[PDB]
Amino acid sequence: SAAAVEAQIAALVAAANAALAADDQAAVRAALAPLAELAKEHPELVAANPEVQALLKALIAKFEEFDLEVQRLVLAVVAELTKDNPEAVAFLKAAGFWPHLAAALRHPDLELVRLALAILSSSLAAVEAFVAALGLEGLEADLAYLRAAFPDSPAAELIAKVEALLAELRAALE
């Protein structure tokens, strides 16, 4: 039931908030990992939950201060919530997310880059939000850099998905 899921969410968010207050990043990971799983299972309910949104805003605001395993799990949560969901883009804009995603795309970790590309490619709305902050040229340059930096990897198909959405956006803006 939805009531059970809501209770499941409250438990996971309580653990994450406790881990953050204690500066225990291992416990942050242990908390975000089942939240990413729950988000895959019930993305409608997780994305709408106000405690999840408050938690995501705090994690996004401090994104680069977290170690890489936490950063991956933050993006893993957002990737599950943005899948087939352009309406999650407005919350991400309000949370200041897109400059953080832009720096993540230039991170040397392929797993982080793949998750960032999964979010970016999730909808035309996501590409529009990214371009509103970084420009057509900024995104084009990212994709060209990533194609050369990460061959024969999950990134290639995600880079192409972004490039196809970008072409649609470019035509509309003309």
Side-chain angles (χ1 to χ4, degrees), residues 46-88:
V46 172
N49 179 289
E51 316 178 74
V52 167
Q53 295 177 18
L55 171 65
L56 284 177
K57 295 190 37 93
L59 294 167
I60 289 161
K62 291 270 173 333
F63 188 74
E64 307 72 19
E65 322 218 83
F66 293 115
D67 57 36
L68 173 63
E69 305 82 11
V70 169
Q71 275 182 58
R72 288 176 185 158
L73 279 164
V74 173
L75 295 199
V77 174
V78 174
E80 297 301 343
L81 300 188
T82 53
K83 192 163 140 128
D84 305 315
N85 186 18
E87 320 222 294

PDB file of all heavy atoms in Angstrom, residues 46-88:
ATOM      1  N   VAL A  46       8.089   8.465  -3.916  1.00  0.00           N
ATOM      2  CA  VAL A  46       9.328   8.970  -3.336  1.00  0.00           C
ATOM      3  C   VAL A  46       9.572  10.409  -3.779  1.00  0.00           C
ATOM      4  O   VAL A  46       9.881  11.284  -2.961  1.00  0.00           O
ATOM      5  CB  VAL A  46      10.500   8.043  -3.707  1.00  0.00           C
ATOM      6  CG1 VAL A  46      11.836   8.653  -3.292  1.00  0.00           C
ATOM      7  CG2 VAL A  46      10.302   6.663  -3.069  1.00  0.00           C
ATOM      8  N   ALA A  47       9.407  10.683  -5.078  1.00  0.00           N
ATOM      9  CA  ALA A  47       9.670  12.027  -5.588  1.00  0.00           C
ATOM     10  C   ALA A  47       8.706  13.056  -5.010  1.00  0.00           C
ATOM     11  O   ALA A  47       9.091  14.210  -4.787  1.00  0.00           O
ATOM     12  CB  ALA A  47       9.601  12.035  -7.116  1.00  0.00           C
ATOM     13  N   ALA A  48       7.457  12.663  -4.756  1.00  0.00           N
ATOM     14  CA  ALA A  48       6.472  13.574  -4.185  1.00  0.00           C
ATOM     15  C   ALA A  48       6.638  13.779  -2.684  1.00  0.00           C
ATOM     16  O   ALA A  48       6.030  14.703  -2.131  1.00  0.00           O
ATOM     17  CB  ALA A  48       5.060  13.060  -4.473  1.00  0.00           C
ATOM     18  N   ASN A  49       7.436  12.957  -2.018  1.00  0.00           N
ATOM     19  CA  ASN A  49       7.500  13.001  -0.562  1.00  0.00           C
ATOM     20  C   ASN A  49       8.271  14.238  -0.112  1.00  0.00           C
ATOM     21  O   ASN A  49       9.411  14.444  -0.545  1.00  0.00           O
ATOM     22  CB  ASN A  49       8.157  11.728  -0.035  1.00  0.00           C
ATOM     23  CG  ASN A  49       8.289  11.716   1.474  1.00  0.00           C
ATOM     24  OD1 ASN A  49       9.089  12.450   2.049  1.00  0.00           O
ATOM     25  ND2 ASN A  49       7.498  10.869   2.125  1.00  0.00           N
ATOM     26  N   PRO A  50       7.693  15.079   0.751  1.00  0.00           N
ATOM     27  CA  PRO A  50       8.389  16.319   1.133  1.00  0.00           C
ATOM     28  C   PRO A  50       9.654  16.094   1.947  1.00  0.00           C
ATOM     29  O   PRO A  50      10.573  16.916   1.862  1.00  0.00           O
ATOM     30  CB  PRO A  50       7.332  17.093   1.935  1.00  0.00           C
ATOM     31  CG  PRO A  50       6.298  16.091   2.312  1.00  0.00           C
ATOM     32  CD  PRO A  50       6.325  15.003   1.291  1.00  0.00           C
ATOM     33  N   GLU A  51       9.734  15.023   2.746  1.00  0.00           N
ATOM     34  CA  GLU A  51      10.982  14.747   3.456  1.00  0.00           C
ATOM     35  C   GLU A  51      12.091  14.343   2.488  1.00  0.00           C
ATOM     36  O   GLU A  51      13.259  14.692   2.694  1.00  0.00           O
ATOM     37  CB  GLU A  51      10.782  13.657   4.512  1.00  0.00           C
ATOM     38  CG  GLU A  51       9.524  13.785   5.353  1.00  0.00           C
ATOM     39  CD  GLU A  51       9.378  12.639   6.346  1.00  0.00           C
ATOM     40  OE1 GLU A  51      10.118  12.627   7.353  1.00  0.00           O
ATOM     41  OE2 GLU A  51       8.524  11.753   6.128  1.00  0.00           O
ATOM     42  N   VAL A  52      11.752  13.586   1.444  1.00  0.00           N
ATOM     43  CA  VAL A  52      12.751  13.241   0.438  1.00  0.00           C
ATOM     44  C   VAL A  52      13.236  14.497  -0.272  1.00  0.00           C
ATOM     45  O   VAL A  52      14.432  14.658  -0.532  1.00  0.00           O
ATOM     46  CB  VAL A  52      12.185  12.214  -0.560  1.00  0.00           C
ATOM     47  CG1 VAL A  52      13.090  12.106  -1.778  1.00  0.00           C
ATOM     48  CG2 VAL A  52      12.046  10.862   0.102  1.00  0.00           C
ATOM     49  N   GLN A  53      12.315  15.409  -0.590  1.00  0.00           N
ATOM     50  CA  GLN A  53      12.703  16.631  -1.288  1.00  0.00           C
ATOM     51  C   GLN A  53      13.603  17.498  -0.419  1.00  0.00           C
ATOM     52  O   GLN A  53      14.572  18.086  -0.909  1.00  0.00           O
ATOM     53  CB  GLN A  53      11.461  17.409  -1.714  1.00  0.00           C
ATOM     54  CG  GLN A  53      10.607  16.692  -2.736  1.00  0.00           C
ATOM     55  CD  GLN A  53       9.348  17.459  -3.066  1.00  0.00           C
ATOM     56  OE1 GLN A  53       9.252  18.655  -2.797  1.00  0.00           O
ATOM     57  NE2 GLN A  53       8.373  16.776  -3.653  1.00  0.00           N
ATOM     58  N   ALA A  54      13.295  17.597   0.877  1.00  0.00           N
ATOM     59  CA  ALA A  54      14.163  18.342   1.781  1.00  0.00           C
ATOM     60  C   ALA A  54      15.536  17.691   1.880  1.00  0.00           C
ATOM     61  O   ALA A  54      16.561  18.384   1.910  1.00  0.00           O
ATOM     62  CB  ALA A  54      13.514  18.446   3.162  1.00  0.00           C
ATOM     63  N   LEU A  55      15.577  16.357   1.931  1.00  0.00           N
ATOM     64  CA  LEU A  55      16.857  15.663   1.992  1.00  0.00           C
ATOM     65  C   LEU A  55      17.660  15.884   0.715  1.00  0.00           C
ATOM     66  O   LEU A  55      18.872  16.135   0.768  1.00  0.00           O
ATOM     67  CB  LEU A  55      16.633  14.170   2.229  1.00  0.00           C
ATOM     68  CG  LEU A  55      17.873  13.283   2.104  1.00  0.00           C
ATOM     69  CD1 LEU A  55      18.894  13.619   3.186  1.00  0.00           C
ATOM     70  CD2 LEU A  55      17.498  11.804   2.143  1.00  0.00           C
ATOM     71  N   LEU A  56      17.000  15.796  -0.440  1.00  0.00           N
ATOM     72  CA  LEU A  56      17.707  15.981  -1.706  1.00  0.00           C
ATOM     73  C   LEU A  56      18.268  17.391  -1.832  1.00  0.00           C
ATOM     74  O   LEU A  56      19.379  17.578  -2.341  1.00  0.00           O
ATOM     75  CB  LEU A  56      16.781  15.662  -2.877  1.00  0.00           C
ATOM     76  CG  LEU A  56      16.561  14.166  -3.086  1.00  0.00           C
ATOM     77  CD1 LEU A  56      15.584  13.909  -4.220  1.00  0.00           C
ATOM     78  CD2 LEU A  56      17.891  13.472  -3.332  1.00  0.00           C
ATOM     79  N   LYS A  57      17.522  18.398  -1.375  1.00  0.00           N
ATOM     80  CA  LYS A  57      18.036  19.764  -1.425  1.00  0.00           C
ATOM     81  C   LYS A  57      19.299  19.915  -0.587  1.00  0.00           C
ATOM     82  O   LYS A  57      20.243  20.598  -0.998  1.00  0.00           O
ATOM     83  CB  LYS A  57      16.970  20.757  -0.967  1.00  0.00           C
ATOM     84  CG  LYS A  57      15.756  20.830  -1.872  1.00  0.00           C
ATOM     85  CD  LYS A  57      14.857  22.004  -1.508  1.00  0.00           C
ATOM     86  CE  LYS A  57      15.668  23.220  -1.082  1.00  0.00           C
ATOM     87  NZ  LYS A  57      15.951  24.148  -2.218  1.00  0.00           N
ATOM     88  N   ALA A  58      19.338  19.288   0.591  1.00  0.00           N
ATOM     89  CA  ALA A  58      20.517  19.406   1.443  1.00  0.00           C
ATOM     90  C   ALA A  58      21.708  18.681   0.837  1.00  0.00           C
ATOM     91  O   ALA A  58      22.840  19.180   0.885  1.00  0.00           O
ATOM     92  CB  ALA A  58      20.216  18.864   2.847  1.00  0.00           C
ATOM     93  N   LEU A  59      21.473  17.500   0.259  1.00  0.00           N
ATOM     94  CA  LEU A  59      22.555  16.757  -0.372  1.00  0.00           C
ATOM     95  C   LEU A  59      23.066  17.489  -1.607  1.00  0.00           C
ATOM     96  O   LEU A  59      24.276  17.532  -1.856  1.00  0.00           O
ATOM     97  CB  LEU A  59      22.073  15.358  -0.746  1.00  0.00           C
ATOM     98  CG  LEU A  59      21.724  14.442   0.431  1.00  0.00           C
ATOM     99  CD1 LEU A  59      20.970  13.226  -0.081  1.00  0.00           C
ATOM    100  CD2 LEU A  59      22.978  14.020   1.179  1.00  0.00           C
ATOM    101  N   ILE A  60      22.159  18.074  -2.385  1.00  0.00           N
ATOM    102  CA  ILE A  60      22.577  18.793  -3.588  1.00  0.00           C
ATOM    103  C   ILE A  60      23.367  20.039  -3.216  1.00  0.00           C
ATOM    104  O   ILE A  60      24.389  20.348  -3.840  1.00  0.00           O
ATOM    105  CB  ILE A  60      21.355  19.131  -4.459  1.00  0.00           C
ATOM    106  CG1 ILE A  60      20.791  17.861  -5.104  1.00  0.00           C
ATOM    107  CG2 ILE A  60      21.710  20.175  -5.528  1.00  0.00           C
ATOM    108  CD1 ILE A  60      19.370  18.011  -5.586  1.00  0.00           C
ATOM    109  N   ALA A  61      22.925  20.762  -2.184  1.00  0.00           N
ATOM    110  CA  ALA A  61      23.607  21.992  -1.789  1.00  0.00           C
ATOM    111  C   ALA A  61      25.047  21.748  -1.359  1.00  0.00           C
ATOM    112  O   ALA A  61      25.879  22.654  -1.475  1.00  0.00           O
ATOM    113  CB  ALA A  61      22.832  22.681  -0.663  1.00  0.00           C
ATOM    114  N   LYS A  62      25.364  20.544  -0.880  1.00  0.00           N
ATOM    115  CA  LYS A  62      26.694  20.216  -0.380  1.00  0.00           C
ATOM    116  C   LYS A  62      27.378  19.155  -1.239  1.00  0.00           C
ATOM    117  O   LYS A  62      28.297  18.476  -0.766  1.00  0.00           O
ATOM    118  CB  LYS A  62      26.592  19.737   1.071  1.00  0.00           C
ATOM    119  CG  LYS A  62      26.201  20.823   2.066  1.00  0.00           C
ATOM    120  CD  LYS A  62      27.396  21.551   2.641  1.00  0.00           C
ATOM    121  CE  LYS A  62      26.964  22.741   3.493  1.00  0.00           C
ATOM    122  NZ  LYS A  62      25.645  23.294   3.072  1.00  0.00           N
ATOM    123  N   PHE A  63      26.969  19.033  -2.508  1.00  0.00           N
ATOM    124  CA  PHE A  63      27.264  17.848  -3.315  1.00  0.00           C
ATOM    125  C   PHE A  63      28.760  17.537  -3.382  1.00  0.00           C
ATOM    126  O   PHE A  63      29.175  16.395  -3.146  1.00  0.00           O
ATOM    127  CB  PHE A  63      26.686  18.035  -4.721  1.00  0.00           C
ATOM    128  CG  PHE A  63      26.761  16.804  -5.581  1.00  0.00           C
ATOM    129  CD1 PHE A  63      25.915  15.728  -5.353  1.00  0.00           C
ATOM    130  CD2 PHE A  63      27.672  16.727  -6.621  1.00  0.00           C
ATOM    131  CE1 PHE A  63      25.977  14.595  -6.148  1.00  0.00           C
ATOM    132  CE2 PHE A  63      27.745  15.596  -7.423  1.00  0.00           C
ATOM    133  CZ  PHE A  63      26.892  14.527  -7.186  1.00  0.00           C
ATOM    134  N   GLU A  64      29.591  18.523  -3.724  1.00  0.00           N
ATOM    135  CA  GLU A  64      31.000  18.191  -3.914  1.00  0.00           C
ATOM    136  C   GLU A  64      31.769  17.997  -2.612  1.00  0.00           C
ATOM    137  O   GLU A  64      32.907  17.518  -2.659  1.00  0.00           O
ATOM    138  CB  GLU A  64      31.719  19.228  -4.795  1.00  0.00           C
ATOM    139  CG  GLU A  64      31.058  19.517  -6.159  1.00  0.00           C
ATOM    140  CD  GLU A  64      29.772  20.307  -6.092  1.00  0.00           C
ATOM    141  OE1 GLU A  64      29.521  20.970  -5.060  1.00  0.00           O
ATOM    142  OE2 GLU A  64      29.003  20.243  -7.071  1.00  0.00           O
ATOM    143  N   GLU A  65      31.183  18.316  -1.456  1.00  0.00           N
ATOM    144  CA  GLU A  65      31.858  18.010  -0.200  1.00  0.00           C
ATOM    145  C   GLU A  65      31.744  16.543   0.192  1.00  0.00           C
ATOM    146  O   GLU A  65      32.501  16.092   1.058  1.00  0.00           O
ATOM    147  CB  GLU A  65      31.314  18.889   0.927  1.00  0.00           C
ATOM    148  CG  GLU A  65      31.002  20.307   0.499  1.00  0.00           C
ATOM    149  CD  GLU A  65      31.356  21.320   1.569  1.00  0.00           C
ATOM    150  OE1 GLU A  65      32.540  21.708   1.652  1.00  0.00           O
ATOM    151  OE2 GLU A  65      30.453  21.727   2.327  1.00  0.00           O
ATOM    152  N   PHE A  66      30.835  15.794  -0.422  1.00  0.00           N
ATOM    153  CA  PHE A  66      30.672  14.385  -0.108  1.00  0.00           C
ATOM    154  C   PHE A  66      31.687  13.539  -0.866  1.00  0.00           C
ATOM    155  O   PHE A  66      32.142  13.902  -1.955  1.00  0.00           O
ATOM    156  CB  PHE A  66      29.255  13.931  -0.453  1.00  0.00           C
ATOM    157  CG  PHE A  66      28.200  14.559   0.408  1.00  0.00           C
ATOM    158  CD1 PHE A  66      27.260  15.417  -0.138  1.00  0.00           C
ATOM    159  CD2 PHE A  66      28.154  14.293   1.769  1.00  0.00           C
ATOM    160  CE1 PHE A  66      26.288  15.998   0.661  1.00  0.00           C
ATOM    161  CE2 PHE A  66      27.188  14.871   2.572  1.00  0.00           C
ATOM    162  CZ  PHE A  66      26.255  15.722   2.019  1.00  0.00           C
ATOM    163  N   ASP A  67      32.039  12.394  -0.285  1.00  0.00           N
ATOM    164  CA  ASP A  67      32.934  11.505  -1.005  1.00  0.00           C
ATOM    165  C   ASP A  67      32.195  10.853  -2.174  1.00  0.00           C
ATOM    166  O   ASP A  67      30.969  10.930  -2.299  1.00  0.00           O
ATOM    167  CB  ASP A  67      33.557  10.464  -0.068  1.00  0.00           C
ATOM    168  CG  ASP A  67      32.532   9.620   0.666  1.00  0.00           C
ATOM    169  OD1 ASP A  67      31.474   9.292   0.088  1.00  0.00           O
ATOM    170  OD2 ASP A  67      32.804   9.267   1.836  1.00  0.00           O
ATOM    171  N   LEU A  68      32.972  10.199  -3.037  1.00  0.00           N
ATOM    172  CA  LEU A  68      32.465   9.800  -4.346  1.00  0.00           C
ATOM    173  C   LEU A  68      31.321   8.799  -4.232  1.00  0.00           C
ATOM    174  O   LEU A  68      30.354   8.864  -5.000  1.00  0.00           O
ATOM    175  CB  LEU A  68      33.605   9.222  -5.175  1.00  0.00           C
ATOM    176  CG  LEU A  68      33.232   8.591  -6.513  1.00  0.00           C
ATOM    177  CD1 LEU A  68      32.640   9.633  -7.444  1.00  0.00           C
ATOM    178  CD2 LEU A  68      34.467   7.959  -7.125  1.00  0.00           C
ATOM    179  N   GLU A  69      31.416   7.861  -3.287  1.00  0.00           N
ATOM    180  CA  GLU A  69      30.365   6.861  -3.136  1.00  0.00           C
ATOM    181  C   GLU A  69      29.040   7.497  -2.741  1.00  0.00           C
ATOM    182  O   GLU A  69      27.978   7.030  -3.168  1.00  0.00           O
ATOM    183  CB  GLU A  69      30.785   5.803  -2.114  1.00  0.00           C
ATOM    184  CG  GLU A  69      32.124   5.123  -2.402  1.00  0.00           C
ATOM    185  CD  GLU A  69      33.322   5.936  -1.936  1.00  0.00           C
ATOM    186  OE1 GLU A  69      33.126   6.932  -1.207  1.00  0.00           O
ATOM    187  OE2 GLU A  69      34.462   5.576  -2.298  1.00  0.00           O
ATOM    188  N   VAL A  70      29.077   8.564  -1.941  1.00  0.00           N
ATOM    189  CA  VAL A  70      27.849   9.284  -1.613  1.00  0.00           C
ATOM    190  C   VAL A  70      27.339  10.043  -2.832  1.00  0.00           C
ATOM    191  O   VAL A  70      26.142  10.020  -3.143  1.00  0.00           O
ATOM    192  CB  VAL A  70      28.076  10.229  -0.418  1.00  0.00           C
ATOM    193  CG1 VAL A  70      26.886  11.166  -0.258  1.00  0.00           C
ATOM    194  CG2 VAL A  70      28.303   9.430   0.859  1.00  0.00           C
ATOM    195  N   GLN A  71      28.240  10.734  -3.537  1.00  0.00           N
ATOM    196  CA  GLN A  71      27.842  11.456  -4.740  1.00  0.00           C
ATOM    197  C   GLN A  71      27.153  10.526  -5.734  1.00  0.00           C
ATOM    198  O   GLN A  71      26.116  10.878  -6.309  1.00  0.00           O
ATOM    199  CB  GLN A  71      29.062  12.114  -5.380  1.00  0.00           C
ATOM    200  CG  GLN A  71      29.429  13.484  -4.819  1.00  0.00           C
ATOM    201  CD  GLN A  71      30.623  14.090  -5.549  1.00  0.00           C
ATOM    202  OE1 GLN A  71      30.589  14.268  -6.765  1.00  0.00           O
ATOM    203  NE2 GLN A  71      31.670  14.419  -4.809  1.00  0.00           N
ATOM    204  N   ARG A  72      27.707   9.328  -5.933  1.00  0.00           N
ATOM    205  CA  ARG A  72      27.081   8.354  -6.825  1.00  0.00           C
ATOM    206  C   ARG A  72      25.662   8.033  -6.376  1.00  0.00           C
ATOM    207  O   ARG A  72      24.734   7.991  -7.190  1.00  0.00           O
ATOM    208  CB  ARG A  72      27.915   7.076  -6.878  1.00  0.00           C
ATOM    209  CG  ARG A  72      29.238   7.176  -7.630  1.00  0.00           C
ATOM    210  CD  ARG A  72      29.974   5.850  -7.497  1.00  0.00           C
ATOM    211  NE  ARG A  72      31.311   5.862  -8.078  1.00  0.00           N
ATOM    212  CZ  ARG A  72      32.271   5.016  -7.732  1.00  0.00           C
ATOM    213  NH1 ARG A  72      32.092   4.126  -6.767  1.00  0.00           N
ATOM    214  NH2 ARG A  72      33.441   5.068  -8.362  1.00  0.00           N
ATOM    215  N   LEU A  73      25.474   7.798  -5.074  1.00  0.00           N
ATOM    216  CA  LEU A  73      24.155   7.414  -4.586  1.00  0.00           C
ATOM    217  C   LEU A  73      23.162   8.566  -4.662  1.00  0.00           C
ATOM    218  O   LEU A  73      21.971   8.337  -4.894  1.00  0.00           O
ATOM    219  CB  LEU A  73      24.259   6.886  -3.153  1.00  0.00           C
ATOM    220  CG  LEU A  73      24.717   5.427  -3.101  1.00  0.00           C
ATOM    221  CD1 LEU A  73      25.189   5.037  -1.704  1.00  0.00           C
ATOM    222  CD2 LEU A  73      23.587   4.526  -3.556  1.00  0.00           C
ATOM    223  N   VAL A  74      23.619   9.802  -4.461  1.00  0.00           N
ATOM    224  CA  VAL A  74      22.735  10.948  -4.664  1.00  0.00           C
ATOM    225  C   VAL A  74      22.236  10.975  -6.103  1.00  0.00           C
ATOM    226  O   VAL A  74      21.034  11.107  -6.364  1.00  0.00           O
ATOM    227  CB  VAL A  74      23.449  12.259  -4.292  1.00  0.00           C
ATOM    228  CG1 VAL A  74      22.586  13.449  -4.668  1.00  0.00           C
ATOM    229  CG2 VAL A  74      23.767  12.286  -2.797  1.00  0.00           C
ATOM    230  N   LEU A  75      23.156  10.847  -7.062  1.00  0.00           N
ATOM    231  CA  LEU A  75      22.745  10.831  -8.461  1.00  0.00           C
ATOM    232  C   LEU A  75      21.913   9.594  -8.784  1.00  0.00           C
ATOM    233  O   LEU A  75      20.994   9.667  -9.606  1.00  0.00           O
ATOM    234  CB  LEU A  75      23.967  10.911  -9.376  1.00  0.00           C
ATOM    235  CG  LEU A  75      24.792  12.206  -9.318  1.00  0.00           C
ATOM    236  CD1 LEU A  75      25.645  12.342 -10.574  1.00  0.00           C
ATOM    237  CD2 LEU A  75      23.908  13.434  -9.148  1.00  0.00           C
ATOM    238  N   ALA A  76      22.211   8.459  -8.147  1.00  0.00           N
ATOM    239  CA  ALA A  76      21.401   7.265  -8.370  1.00  0.00           C
ATOM    240  C   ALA A  76      19.960   7.488  -7.933  1.00  0.00           C
ATOM    241  O   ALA A  76      19.025   7.070  -8.624  1.00  0.00           O
ATOM    242  CB  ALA A  76      22.010   6.067  -7.644  1.00  0.00           C
ATOM    243  N   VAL A  77      19.755   8.157  -6.792  1.00  0.00           N
ATOM    244  CA  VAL A  77      18.395   8.477  -6.362  1.00  0.00           C
ATOM    245  C   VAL A  77      17.715   9.373  -7.389  1.00  0.00           C
ATOM    246  O   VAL A  77      16.588   9.110  -7.819  1.00  0.00           O
ATOM    247  CB  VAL A  77      18.397   9.129  -4.969  1.00  0.00           C
ATOM    248  CG1 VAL A  77      16.989   9.593  -4.605  1.00  0.00           C
ATOM    249  CG2 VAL A  77      18.921   8.155  -3.919  1.00  0.00           C
ATOM    250  N   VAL A  78      18.393  10.449  -7.800  1.00  0.00           N
ATOM    251  CA  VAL A  78      17.780  11.389  -8.734  1.00  0.00           C
ATOM    252  C   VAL A  78      17.519  10.718 -10.077  1.00  0.00           C
ATOM    253  O   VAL A  78      16.517  11.002 -10.742  1.00  0.00           O
ATOM    254  CB  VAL A  78      18.658  12.646  -8.886  1.00  0.00           C
ATOM    255  CG1 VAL A  78      18.095  13.555  -9.967  1.00  0.00           C
ATOM    256  CG2 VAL A  78      18.765  13.396  -7.552  1.00  0.00           C
ATOM    257  N   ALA A  79      18.400   9.807 -10.491  1.00  0.00           N
ATOM    258  CA  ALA A  79      18.195   9.133 -11.770  1.00  0.00           C
ATOM    259  C   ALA A  79      16.924   8.289 -11.749  1.00  0.00           C
ATOM    260  O   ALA A  79      16.193   8.224 -12.743  1.00  0.00           O
ATOM    261  CB  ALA A  79      19.413   8.277 -12.115  1.00  0.00           C
ATOM    262  N   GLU A  80      16.634   7.646 -10.615  1.00  0.00           N
ATOM    263  CA  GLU A  80      15.406   6.865 -10.511  1.00  0.00           C
ATOM    264  C   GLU A  80      14.171   7.758 -10.505  1.00  0.00           C
ATOM    265  O   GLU A  80      13.125   7.374 -11.041  1.00  0.00           O
ATOM    266  CB  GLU A  80      15.437   6.002  -9.247  1.00  0.00           C
ATOM    267  CG  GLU A  80      16.543   4.950  -9.221  1.00  0.00           C
ATOM    268  CD  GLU A  80      16.483   3.962 -10.379  1.00  0.00           C
ATOM    269  OE1 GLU A  80      15.433   3.859 -11.049  1.00  0.00           O
ATOM    270  OE2 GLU A  80      17.505   3.286 -10.622  1.00  0.00           O
ATOM    271  N   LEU A  81      14.277   8.950  -9.913  1.00  0.00           N
ATOM    272  CA  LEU A  81      13.141   9.858  -9.816  1.00  0.00           C
ATOM    273  C   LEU A  81      12.899  10.638 -11.105  1.00  0.00           C
ATOM    274  O   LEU A  81      11.767  11.065 -11.356  1.00  0.00           O
ATOM    275  CB  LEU A  81      13.355  10.828  -8.655  1.00  0.00           C
ATOM    276  CG  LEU A  81      13.503  10.164  -7.285  1.00  0.00           C
ATOM    277  CD1 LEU A  81      13.515  11.214  -6.188  1.00  0.00           C
ATOM    278  CD2 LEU A  81      12.375   9.154  -7.054  1.00  0.00           C
ATOM    279  N   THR A  82      13.929  10.852 -11.923  1.00  0.00           N
ATOM    280  CA  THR A  82      13.744  11.584 -13.171  1.00  0.00           C
ATOM    281  C   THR A  82      13.396  10.682 -14.351  1.00  0.00           C
ATOM    282  O   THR A  82      12.983  11.195 -15.395  1.00  0.00           O
ATOM    283  CB  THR A  82      14.998  12.409 -13.511  1.00  0.00           C
ATOM    284  OG1 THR A  82      16.158  11.569 -13.493  1.00  0.00           O
ATOM    285  CG2 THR A  82      15.187  13.552 -12.520  1.00  0.00           C
ATOM    286  N   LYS A  83      13.539   9.366 -14.208  1.00  0.00           N
ATOM    287  CA  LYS A  83      13.221   8.438 -15.290  1.00  0.00           C
ATOM    288  C   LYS A  83      11.778   8.616 -15.757  1.00  0.00           C
ATOM    289  O   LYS A  83      10.843   8.509 -14.960  1.00  0.00           O
ATOM    290  CB  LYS A  83      13.457   7.002 -14.823  1.00  0.00           C
ATOM    291  CG  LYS A  83      13.437   5.965 -15.934  1.00  0.00           C
ATOM    292  CD  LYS A  83      14.087   4.668 -15.476  1.00  0.00           C
ATOM    293  CE  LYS A  83      13.324   3.455 -15.984  1.00  0.00           C
ATOM    294  NZ  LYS A  83      14.216   2.490 -16.684  1.00  0.00           N
ATOM    295  N   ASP A  84      11.607   8.902 -17.052  1.00  0.00           N
ATOM    296  CA  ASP A  84      10.287   9.126 -17.657  1.00  0.00           C
ATOM    297  C   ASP A  84       9.475  10.159 -16.882  1.00  0.00           C
ATOM    298  O   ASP A  84       8.245  10.088 -16.824  1.00  0.00           O
ATOM    299  CB  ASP A  84       9.495   7.820 -17.778  1.00  0.00           C
ATOM    300  CG  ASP A  84      10.251   6.746 -18.528  1.00  0.00           C
ATOM    301  OD1 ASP A  84      10.835   7.061 -19.587  1.00  0.00           O
ATOM    302  OD2 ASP A  84      10.250   5.584 -18.061  1.00  0.00           O
ATOM    303  N   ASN A  85      10.152  11.130 -16.276  1.00  0.00           N
ATOM    304  CA  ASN A  85       9.504  12.082 -15.377  1.00  0.00           C
ATOM    305  C   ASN A  85      10.086  13.472 -15.591  1.00  0.00           C
ATOM    306  O   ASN A  85      10.947  13.931 -14.832  1.00  0.00           O
ATOM    307  CB  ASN A  85       9.654  11.634 -13.921  1.00  0.00           C
ATOM    308  CG  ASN A  85       8.878  12.507 -12.963  1.00  0.00           C
ATOM    309  OD1 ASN A  85       7.975  13.239 -13.368  1.00  0.00           O
ATOM    310  ND2 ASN A  85       9.218  12.429 -11.682  1.00  0.00           N
ATOM    311  N   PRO A  86       9.628  14.180 -16.627  1.00  0.00           N
ATOM    312  CA  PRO A  86      10.076  15.569 -16.810  1.00  0.00           C
ATOM    313  C   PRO A  86       9.627  16.496 -15.698  1.00  0.00           C
ATOM    314  O   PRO A  86      10.242  17.552 -15.513  1.00  0.00           O
ATOM    315  CB  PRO A  86       9.460  15.983 -18.155  1.00  0.00           C
ATOM    316  CG  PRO A  86       8.465  14.935 -18.512  1.00  0.00           C
ATOM    317  CD  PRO A  86       8.659  13.736 -17.645  1.00  0.00           C
ATOM    318  N   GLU A  87       8.583  16.144 -14.943  1.00  0.00           N
ATOM    319  CA  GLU A  87       8.106  17.060 -13.916  1.00  0.00           C
ATOM    320  C   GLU A  87       9.048  17.149 -12.724  1.00  0.00           C
ATOM    321  O   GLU A  87       8.930  18.091 -11.935  1.00  0.00           O
ATOM    322  CB  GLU A  87       6.705  16.653 -13.461  1.00  0.00           C
ATOM    323  CG  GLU A  87       5.829  16.206 -14.610  1.00  0.00           C
ATOM    324  CD  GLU A  87       4.417  16.729 -14.507  1.00  0.00           C
ATOM    325  OE1 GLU A  87       3.690  16.327 -13.575  1.00  0.00           O
ATOM    326  OE2 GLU A  87       4.041  17.556 -15.363  1.00  0.00           O
ATOM    327  N   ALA A  88       9.980  16.207 -12.579  1.00  0.00           N
ATOM    328  CA  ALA A  88      11.000  16.321 -11.543  1.00  0.00           C
ATOM    329  C   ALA A  88      12.019  17.411 -11.842  1.00  0.00           C
ATOM    330  O   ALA A  88      12.801  17.767 -10.953  1.00  0.00           O
ATOM    331  CB  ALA A  88      11.717  14.983 -11.367  1.00  0.00           C
TER     332      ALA A  88
END
